[PDB]
Design a protein around this ligand. Structure first.
Ligand SMILES: CNCc1cccc(Cl)c1
Lengths: 412, 412
């Protein structure tokens, strides 16, 4: 058999706020976090906007000296991670520290640090490269620094699965607990790819919306006028915990993680298959994992990136998996408001799926003014929808055809 | 309930060879793969040598057209993965493709690619960034491109845990199989960090040997004259397979993977604790996981990076875990010959641990002229040692205090 895994703490940096309740307030109000990118010359770039984290104070978390050693993506992961542990009320002791682990991931990692150290390398030569360049830039340093700050001695690792990172991190963290490797995990993802190489890299593949005149309308999942995704920054962290461990200390339980699906499309390097076969296999894997029939699913937080091929594949996938129940469930893209946090997308959207269960409300897909051909599901267009939600899915799909599905159930 | 996991295929690029057999002959003969770097001008760098893959022909594996789009770390990852899958004799069919996944990791991923596109960005502008920059550079695309080429629709992900990546990738892929999420996984790692940012970054931290005038003697694990690790490039991939699946199809079985340990040190961002506490916890987790008497351990493939602090910590850990049996086992560092393949270190070294079991020989630590204070175990100085080996252990440690142990034994 298998142990049960519940969510006892959550933490977040998003384009909508510097914590969960501020972010969620934005989500349910249909507020956009998208705006022209500041303190950065994007004149030569075809995209000049995205979801930036606004007003973040790293010194709430770290000394200025420690923050100077770490890429923004690491600072954001630590912020969410420290919020999530504090939210959980968990007391780390000598008796439990070996049973508490970390899996915080990134799609892209320390691009901003790499770019500034490149500046120094090209202009002055290697002797201007920071000594903290390597440990301050690598993706496992959110897990590493968190474990060192808090004395966590359980499983210590990082996933990097492109836009699927957050979903995979949480899912495999839940496996570690379910199969007795740990009693607590801090899991999720962080991303800060709003550098030249980030905007430039996605810009060169024409993956980005170029709607510079109306940044708040750029992200329009399933809308016939969508033209690619919106690049966003931030982090999500969840405290995952074995149920008996949570009950014994009187933890506040947000929801239970009942199901985790992984699948590979094995299709294309960047494009999803049009019939959504991969997303369909992954969701079916996750529902089997939960012992749930597709009819029991009430809410899906879609990947919903606002790319032509991505949005339509997810419609096909849901119709395929859910048949006669496909219109009954509500499916929304919170990327309509946050944009695409890449590796952290799965983390913040897991938290929104948990909060949809707590508050019995499907978040809107804003900007869905003209649903595209065959986009006829309940996509919660424009405004939040109060409804019955016992079971919520969060889907992620990524470059390399890598799929992730988490199934959350109400806990009472 | 937990299934057993065996190795049925292996593949490799190392500084000693373009496959496993050729690499392994170099190991047993005590050959160095370390040489002045030729692919760039390192006159302004304090370290000008490393373990390059020599004469790699990507067109043994991939079309020139696809190869041009991929960082060397991806090319190296795919070459090892293709070798391993071919070496397994496994046939991918519609009957099994959903039960076959991949977890190939990297410490740093496409740093050469990111630097070249950085140069283009700074000298030309954003319009000269390759459209292939992202899918061609990010860590998860070894797993991605392998799944696309072979049609693997099982779990598809990637770990990044710095110098522990290869051991974690293998260990967690074994967990996937053990607990029924897959019947087969291709798992290991690849690294190509020998660019300006790589040698410069490790250079800035003064982590690297500066023995430019004698590169073959640079890597000298536990030698009193060691002065840092030697940076090396390459790939290791293994085909992990549920025992009964392997038995059913008549697979040749190299060895059984009986044990996996992870622990975080929670000590320091980059320095290991002098007493080896994190390595000790990790090895004890792994031996308990394998249901072993510690006295069953015959051979350890050490992390053995040739740093002052890392090398003695490992002696401390092995003495603490094995007590008087620490004087009966053999421990060596093949990094004496290969140098430190970083995220691929744990992958090549897992394969060397398996071949130590097949061939009943402890690979040497070359350059161990003057063992340092306290380094008085059988470290197999200078020359391969034929000997009884039923149980072999492979250790990795990385930045972030991240530890990994794999336990293999002979299978009949
Ligand atoms: C099905 N996978 C279960 C698993 C994954 C990772 C670690 C452990 Cl213990 C178990």
């Amino acid at each position: 058999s298998r142990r049960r895994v519940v969510i006892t703490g959550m933490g977040m940096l998003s384009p909508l706020g510097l914590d969960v309740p501020s972010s969620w307030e934005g989500i349910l109000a249909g507020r956009s976090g998208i705006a022209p990118i500041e303190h950065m010359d994007l004149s030569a770039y075809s995209t000049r906007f995205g979801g930036s984290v606004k007003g973040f104070n790293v010194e709430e978390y770290l000394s200025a000296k420690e923050a100077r050693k770490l890429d923004l993506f690491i600072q954001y992961g630590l912020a969410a991670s420290f919020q999530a542990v504090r939210d959980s009320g968990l007391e780390v002791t000598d008796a439990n520290r070996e049973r508490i682990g970390v899996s915080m991931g990134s799609g892209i990692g320390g691009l901003t640090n790499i770019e500034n150290n490149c500046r120094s390398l090209f202009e002055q030569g290697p002797r201007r490269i920071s000594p903290f360049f390597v440990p301050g830039s690598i993706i496992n340093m959110v897990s590493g620094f968190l474990s060192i700050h808090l004395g966590l001695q359980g499983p210590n690792y990082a996933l990097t699965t492109a836009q699927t990172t957050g979903t995979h991190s949480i899912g495999m963290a839940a496996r570690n607990i379910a199969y007795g490797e740990a009693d607590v995990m801090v899991a999720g993802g962080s991303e800060m790819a709003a550098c030249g190489l980030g905007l430039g890299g996605f810009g060169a593949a024409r993956a980005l919306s170029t709607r510079n005149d109306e940044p708040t309308r750029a992200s329009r999942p399933w809308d016939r006028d969508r033209d690619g995704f919106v690049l966003s920054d931030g982090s999500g962290a969840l405290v995952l915990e074995e149920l008996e461990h949570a009950r014994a200390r009187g933890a506040r339980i947000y929801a239970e993680l009942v199901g985790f699906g992984m699948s590979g499309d094995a299709f294309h390097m960047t494009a999803p298959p049009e019939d959504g076969a991969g997303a369909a296999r992954c969701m079916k894997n996750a529902l089997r994992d939960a012992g749930l029939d597709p009819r029991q699913v009430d809410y899906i937080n879609a990947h919903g990136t606002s790319t032509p091929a991505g949005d339509i594949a997810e419609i096909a996938a849901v119709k395929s998996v859910f048949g006669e129940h496909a219109h009954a469930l509500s499916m929304s893209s919170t990327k309509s408001m946050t944009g695409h946090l890449l590796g952290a997308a799965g983390a913040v959207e897991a938290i929104f799926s948990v909060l949809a269960l707590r508050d019995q409300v499907a978040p809107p897909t804003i900007n869905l003014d003209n649903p595209d051909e065959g986009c006829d599901l309940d996509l919660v267009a424009h405004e939040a929808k109060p409804r019955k939600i016992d079971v919520a899915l969060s889907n992620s799909f990524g470059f390399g055809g890598t799929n992730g599905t988490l199934v959350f159930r109400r806990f009472a």
